[PDB]
């Protein structure tokens, strides 16, 4: 479908997207921001060190 230029391939393209959906875009946050939101509680020292 990349080399293809007609709308006939659009049906199979949508079907492939149904079977195997790719990741188009996504928001992100630093890896040290998730350690604060853990069940382990306070991790300020390790969080600052990793930052």
């Amino acid at each position: 479908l990349a080399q293809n230029r007609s709308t006939i391939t659009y049906r199979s393209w949508g079907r492939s997207l149904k079977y195997n959906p790719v990741v188009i875009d996504f928001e992100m946050q630093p890896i040290h921001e998730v350690l604060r939101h853990t069940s382990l509680g306070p991790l300020e020292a390790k969080r600052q060190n990793l930052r």
């Binding site: 230029r5 007609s6 709308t7 659009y10 049906r11 393209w13 949508g14 079907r15 997207l17």
Partner: protein
């Protein structure tokens, strides 16, 4: 006898022509709503009908 003839000629001509023209056309679609193969066929970027 004395006789002397003087003749002088000069010619100049320049012609110039220039033409430029451009035409740009664009078309954008926006569809929201539909997950089945119907919207997949409708999502064809290639005729707004």
């Amino acid at each position: 006898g004395v006789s002397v003839g003087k003749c002088r000629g000069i010619l100049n001509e320049i012609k110039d022509r220039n033409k430029r023209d451009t035409m740009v056309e664009d078309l954008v679609v926006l569809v929201r709503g539909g997950a089945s193969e119907h919207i997949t066929t409708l999502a064809y970027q290639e005729l707004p009908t």
